[PDB]
Amino acid sequence: MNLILLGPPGAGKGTQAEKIVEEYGIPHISTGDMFRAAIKEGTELGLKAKEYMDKGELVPDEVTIGLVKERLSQPDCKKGFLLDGFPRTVAQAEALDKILKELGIKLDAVINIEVPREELLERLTGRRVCRQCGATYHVIFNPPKVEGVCDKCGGELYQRSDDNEETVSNRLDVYEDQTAPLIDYYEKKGLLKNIDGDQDIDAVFADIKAALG
Ligand SMILES: Nc1ncnc2c1ncn2[C@@H]1O[C@H](COP(=O)(O)OP(=O)(O)O)[C@@H](O)[C@H]1O
Ligand SMILES: Nc1ncnc2c1ncn2[C@@H]1O[C@H](COP(=O)(O)OP(=O)(O)O)[C@@H](O)[C@H]1O
Ligand SMILES: [Zn+2]
Q1: Is the CB of 59 inside a 6 Å radius of any atom of ligand 2?
Q2: In terms of CATH architecture, what is 1-213?
């Protein structure tokens, strides 16, 4: 299974990705997670990417494409993968098609998670993420079993530096301007399936599973 999840920030892509990659035993490839790891490590790349991220702007295309090319070239991607947060622009989608061609890989499905914009702010400002493994929770919609602690690794949960109201507004605007047009790009391939993300987490997952089956 070679899969892309599409949808606005806050739609539930990372949450569903965790469930999907457990179901299929494939890697979860998230460009945001790569950037956040770089920031945690204090790398030059991370520190520079953070400047864009904290403004709610996209990190530039070529650097992001190169990270994904390198990641998809690893042996653990030969038997499937899930892209979550890439592509974000038409240039990235075209570049991904070229990467996949070079690797001899064909996409199987593109899942577009639809959620009304009005739901997204509270999902995002209440999001809490694990420092050590990147697992995603929500203060009320999907809490950890123990407050402030990751269920998987025991790591501390935190609020991302971009999950504040001002920055959210800009991220949603960027999504509508740059990223929403990708729905048409993947519709043309005959791979796109739309999912109602305005449901509880397990109902959304059920619908994704049904669509992929
Ligand atoms: N169906 C849902 N209903 C309510 N909250 C959800 C749902 N799916 C995810 N969440 C929560 O909303 C926030 C955004 O989900 P996330 O998976 O991080 O979205 P994305 O990766 O698309 O930005 C997280 O805090 C998550 O726990
Ligand atoms: N493919 C990408 N291209 C450019 N910037 C990206 C990409 N993926 C992540 N980013 C950067 O990381 C930020 C957070 O994105 P992400 O982790 O996917 O969270 P969200 O699910 O809330 O959109 C983006 O607003 C952007 O600055
Ligand atoms: Zn963790």
Answers
A1: yes
A2: 3-Layer(aba) Sandwich (3.40)
